[PDB]
Amino acid sequence: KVRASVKRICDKCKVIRRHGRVYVICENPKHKQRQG
Amino acid sequence: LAQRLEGLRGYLDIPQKETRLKELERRLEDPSLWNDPEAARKVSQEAARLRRTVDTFRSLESDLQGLLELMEELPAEEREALKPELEEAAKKLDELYHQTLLNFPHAEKNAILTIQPGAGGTEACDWAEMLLRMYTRFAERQGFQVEVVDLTPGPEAGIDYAQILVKGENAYGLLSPEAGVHRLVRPSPFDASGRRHTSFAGVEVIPEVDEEVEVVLKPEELRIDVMRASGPGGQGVNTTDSAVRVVHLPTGITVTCQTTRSQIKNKELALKILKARLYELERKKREEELKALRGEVEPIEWGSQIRSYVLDKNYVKDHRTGLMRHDPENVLDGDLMDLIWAGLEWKAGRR
Amino acid sequence: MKKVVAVVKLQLPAGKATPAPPVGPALGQHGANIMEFVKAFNAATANMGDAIVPVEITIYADRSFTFVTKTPPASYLIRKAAGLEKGAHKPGREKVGRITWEQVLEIAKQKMPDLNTTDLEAAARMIAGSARSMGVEVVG
RNA sequence: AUGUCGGCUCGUCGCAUCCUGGGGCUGAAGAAGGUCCCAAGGGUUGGGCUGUUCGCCCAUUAAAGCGGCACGCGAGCUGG
RNA sequence: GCCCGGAUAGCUCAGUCGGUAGAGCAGGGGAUUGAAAAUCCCCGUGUCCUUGGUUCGAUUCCGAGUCCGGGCACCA
Ligand SMILES: [Mg+2]
Ligand SMILES: [Mg+2]
Ligand SMILES: [Mg+2]
Ligand SMILES: [Mg+2]
Ligand SMILES: [Mg+2]
Ligand SMILES: [Mg+2]
Ligand SMILES: [Mg+2]
Ligand SMILES: [Mg+2]
Ligand SMILES: [Mg+2]
Ligand SMILES: [Mg+2]
Ligand SMILES: [Mg+2]
Ligand SMILES: [Mg+2]
Ligand SMILES: [Mg+2]
Ligand SMILES: [Mg+2]
Ligand SMILES: [Mg+2]
Ligand SMILES: [Mg+2]
Ligand SMILES: [Mg+2]
Ligand SMILES: [Mg+2]
Ligand SMILES: [Mg+2]
Ligand SMILES: [Zn+2]
Numbered sequence: 021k022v023r024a025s026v027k028r029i030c031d032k033c034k035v036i037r038r039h040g041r042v043y044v045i046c047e048n049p050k051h052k053q054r055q056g
Numbered sequence: 057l058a059q060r061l062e063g064l065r066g067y068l069d070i071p072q073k074e075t076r077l078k079e080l081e082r083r084l085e086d087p088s089l090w091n092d093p094e095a096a097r098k099v100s101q102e103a104a105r106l107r108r109t110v111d112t113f114r115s116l117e118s119d120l121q122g123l124l125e126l127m128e129e130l131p132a133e134e135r136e137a138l139k140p141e142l143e144e145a146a147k148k149l150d151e152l153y154h155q156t157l158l159n160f161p162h163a164e165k166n167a168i169l170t171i172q173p174g175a176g177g178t179e180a181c182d183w184a185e186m187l188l189r190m191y192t193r194f195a196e197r198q199g200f201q202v203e204v205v206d207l208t209p210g211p212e213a214g215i216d217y218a219q220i221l222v223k224g225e226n227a228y229g230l231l232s233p234e235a236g237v238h239r240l241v242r243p244s245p246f247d248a249s250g251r252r253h254t255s256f257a258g259v260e261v262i263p264e265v266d267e268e269v270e271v272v273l274k275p276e277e278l279r280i281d282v283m284r285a286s287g288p289g290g291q292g293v294n295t296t297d298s299a300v301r302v303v304h305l306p307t308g309i310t311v312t313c314q315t316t317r318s319q320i321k322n323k324e325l326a327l328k329i330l331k332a333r334l335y336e337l338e339r340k341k342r343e344e345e346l347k348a349l350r351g352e353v354e355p356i357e358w359g360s361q362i363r364s365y366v367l368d369k370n371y372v373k374d375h376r377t378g379l380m381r382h383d384p385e386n387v388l389d390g391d392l393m394d395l396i397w398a399g400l401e402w403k404a405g406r407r
Numbered sequence: 408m409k410k411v412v413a414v415v416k417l418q419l420p421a422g423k424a425t426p427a428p429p430v431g432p433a434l435g436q437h438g439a440n441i442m443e444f445v446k447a448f449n450a451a452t453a454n455m456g457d458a459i460v461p462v463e464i465t466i467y468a469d470r471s472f473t474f475v476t477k478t479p480p481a482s483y484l485i486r487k488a489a490g491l492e493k494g495a496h497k498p499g500r501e502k503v504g505r506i507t508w509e510q511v512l513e514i515a516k517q518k519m520p521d522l523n524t525t526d527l528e529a530a531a532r533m534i535a536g537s538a539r540s541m542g543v544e545v546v547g
Numbered sequence: 548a549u550g551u552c553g554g555c556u557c558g559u560c561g562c563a564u565c566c567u568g569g570g571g572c573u574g575a576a577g578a579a580g581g582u583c584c585c586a587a588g589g590g591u592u593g594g595g596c597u598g599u600u601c602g603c604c605c606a607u608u609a610a611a612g613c614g615g616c617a618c619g620c621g622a623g624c625u626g627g
Numbered sequence: 628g629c630c631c632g633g634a635u636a637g638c639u640c641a642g643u644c645g646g647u648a649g650a651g652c653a654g655g656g657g658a659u660u661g662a663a664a665a666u667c668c669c670c671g672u673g674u675c676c677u678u679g680g681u682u683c684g685a686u687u688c689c690g691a692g693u694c695c696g697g698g699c700a701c702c703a
Contacts, residue, residue, distance in 0.1 A: 021572060021583055049572060056584085078427030082435045097428040104426065178663095212663050246662085283601040284552070290703045294552045295618075301601075310602090316700075321628080 026053040061153040074103030109152050112145035157400045163229025165263035167222035174256030174356040181214030183240040183255040188218050194390045200224035228263040233399025235261035239361035242368055258356045271335050279303040285314035302326040377402045413437055416463030422449045439470040459483050478521050481537050484514040495542030502544035511535050
C-alpha cells in the first residue's frame with residue numbers, strides 16, 4: 021500500500037506517476053501502491 | 057498371532073466401513089471445507105489391503121505345503137515364480153499386522169522403564185530386582201542398546217529403584233504395555249517358614265524426548281516501564297527514572313527493581329529474575345505434561361496388578377487380556393513378544 | 408485430443424477397477440455410471456491384457472460417454488523393460504536400471520499408433536528421453 | 548543561590564490520533580473487526596490501594612491518547 | 628560492576644621449593660551370620676575446572692575464561 025520502495029508485483033501493474041507522487045496500479049487492489 | 061492376526065483388525069468390520077468411506081466420497085457435495093478427502097484414500101488403502109492381506113495369507117496358506125512339491129521336486133521355475141512373491145509375503149504378514157498396532161503417536165522413541173517395589177516390603181524389593189533382569193535380558197537379546205540410569209539396591213534385599221534407557225526403534229511402543237503393576241506369588245524366600253505371600257511392583261515406561269533446554273524471550277513477549285524510584289536519594293531519587301519494571305504479558309508475571317541507581321543495571325537484574333521465575337512456570341508445566349504420560353492408574357497396592365506371576369503353581373495370568381501361560385520362568389527372562397502384541401491389541405482397541 | 412465437452416481422461420489397470428480412489432468420483436462427479444463403465448471397461452481390458460490403459464472418457468447430459476483406450480504410458484513399457492518398481496526419485500544421474508537402443512525401439516513400435524511420427528527413430532527418441540525422465544540410462 | 552517529587556490550580560502547544568469526521572486494502576457476507584492514509588475542531592469520567600510518578604483493581608464510556616512547555620506552573624498553594 | 632578467596636577420586640575435603648598425589652565416606656571381591664547391619668581382611672579408579680604461556684618438565688608459577696563463596700556500590 022504505502023511505503024518507501026514502491027515496486028511491481030505483477031505483469032499487470034503500471035508505474036503511474038501522478039502529483040509528484042509515484043503510485044502503482046494493478047488489476048487487483050492488493051497491489052495498489054503509493055509512496056510515503 | 058499369524059493365523060489369528062486377521063480377525064482383530066476389523067477383519068469383517070473394516071470391509072464394511074471401507075465402502076462407507078467411498079460412500080459419502082462420491083457425489084461431490086459442494087466439496088467446500090476440506091476434511092475427509094485427506095483421510096479419504098489413505099483410509100481406503102487400508103481396506104483393499106486386507107486382500108493383499110488375504111493374498112499374503114493365501115499365498116502363505118497355499119504355502120503350508122507350498123513345498124510338498126519341493127519335497128518331491130527341488131529344481132524348476134514354475135515353482136520359483138510365486139516364491140519371489142512368497143518370501144515378501146511372510147514379511148507383510150507380520151507388517152500389515154504390527155504396522156496396525158504400533159500405529160500410534162510416538163512409539164519409535166527410546167523408552168525408559170522404572171521399577172519401584174510395591175507392597176511386601178523386602179519381597180517386593182527383590183521381586184522388583186527380578187522384574188529388572190527380565191526386560192533387560194529381553195530388550196538386550198531383542199537388539200536394543202540398554203543403558204542403566206539408576207539402581208538403588210535397597211535395605212535387606214533386592215532394590216528400591218531402577219531406571220534404564222531402551223535404545224532402539226519402537227522400543228517404547230514395545231515396552232509400553234508393560235507399564236503397570238506386576239504381582240508375584242510364591243512362598244517368601246525371605247519369610248521364616250518359607251510361607252506363601254504375595255508381592256507387588258510398579259513398572260513405569262516413557263519415551264525419550266527432551267534433550268535441550270531453551271528459554272529465550274522475545275522483546276514483544278514483554279513490556280518495560282520506568283519510573284522514579286521510591287526511597288533515599290535527595291535530588292537524585294527525585295528526578296531520575298532509575299526504577300524499572302519488566303512484565304511478561306503472556307504469563308502476566310511482572311518484576312520490579314530499584315536495586316541500584318541505574319535504570320540499566322535494574323533492567324538487567326529485573327529480567328534476570330523474570331527469566332528465573334519463567335523457567336519455574338516452564339518446568340511446572342514441563343512436568344504436568346510429561347507426568348500425565350505415566351498414566352492415570354497404579355496405586356501399587358493390592359488388586360491393582362495387570363498380570364500376576366506364580367511359581368508354586370507354574371503360570372502367569374495377564375488380567376488385562378485374560379491370557380495365562382504356564383511358564384513363569386521363561387517369561388521372566390525374555391519371553392514377552394507374545395504378551396506384548398496382545399497387550400497392545402487390548403489397548404489400541406479403544407483409541 | 409479431438410472434440411471437447413466435459414471430458415475427463417484418466418489411467419486404469421487390469422480388470423481391477425471401480426474403487427472410488429482411482430476412478431469412482433473420477434467420472435461419477437460429472438454425472439455418470441460407475442456401472443456402465445466398471446464392466447464396460449473390463450470388456451476390453453480383459454481382451455488386450457492386464458496393465459495400464461490410458462482411457463479418456465468424454466461426457467454428455469445423458470451421463471453418456473466415449474471411453475477411448477490407448478497404449479499404456481510410455482513410462483510403463485520402459486519400467487518392466489528393466490525390472491523397476493518405482494521411477495527413481497531423482498533422475499539425471501542414478502540409473503536404477505537400464506534399457507538398450509533396441510529394447511527402446513520395440514516399445515516405440517507399441518506406441519507408434521498413438522504418437523504422430525511414423526518413423527521408428529523419431530519415436531524411439533521421445534522414449535530414450537523418457538529414460539532421463541526416470542533415471543534409466545540407455546544402453547548404446 | 549537557576550528551590551528540588553507527587554498533588555492542587557491555571558492552562559497552552561505538538562501529532563508520532565484514544566474517541567468522534569473522511570478514505571484505500573482485507574483472509575471485507577452482514578453487524579463486528581484488522582491494517583495503512585487524511586484529519587486535532589472539540590472531547591478524553593468517578594472511585595479503591597500507595598507520598599508516589601508508574602501501575603493493578605472496581606464501576607462505567609464514543610474514548611477513558613501519548614508527549615513539549617526549567618520532566619510548565621512553590622514572589623500561585625500544598626509539603627505526604 | 629569493582630576487589631578478595633576458591634575448583635583435586637563418586638560425596639566432603641588435605642597436599643608440594645615446580646617432577647610426587649592423599650584422607651573419612653561411598654563403592655567392588657572375600658569373612659563371620661540362618662539372613663541382613665555392624666565388624667574383619669583385599670582393593671582401585673583422578674588431565675588436580677577451561678584455555679594460553681614460561682620451563683627441559685606445570686596439579687603446582689604467571690595472562691585470560693567459566694561456575695560458585697565473600698566484601699563494597701556511598702554524597703547528592
Ligand atoms: Mg521404597
Ligand atoms: Mg532415590
Ligand atoms: Mg543518604
Ligand atoms: Mg538526572
Ligand atoms: Mg535570587
Ligand atoms: Mg497524521
Ligand atoms: Mg462491516
Ligand atoms: Mg481522589
Ligand atoms: Mg491512602
Ligand atoms: Mg499536557
Ligand atoms: Mg517540575
Ligand atoms: Mg515531611
Ligand atoms: Mg507538618
Ligand atoms: Mg569435589
Ligand atoms: Mg610420580
Ligand atoms: Mg583413604
Ligand atoms: Mg563387602
Ligand atoms: Mg559381603
Ligand atoms: Mg586408588
Ligand atoms: Zn501488480
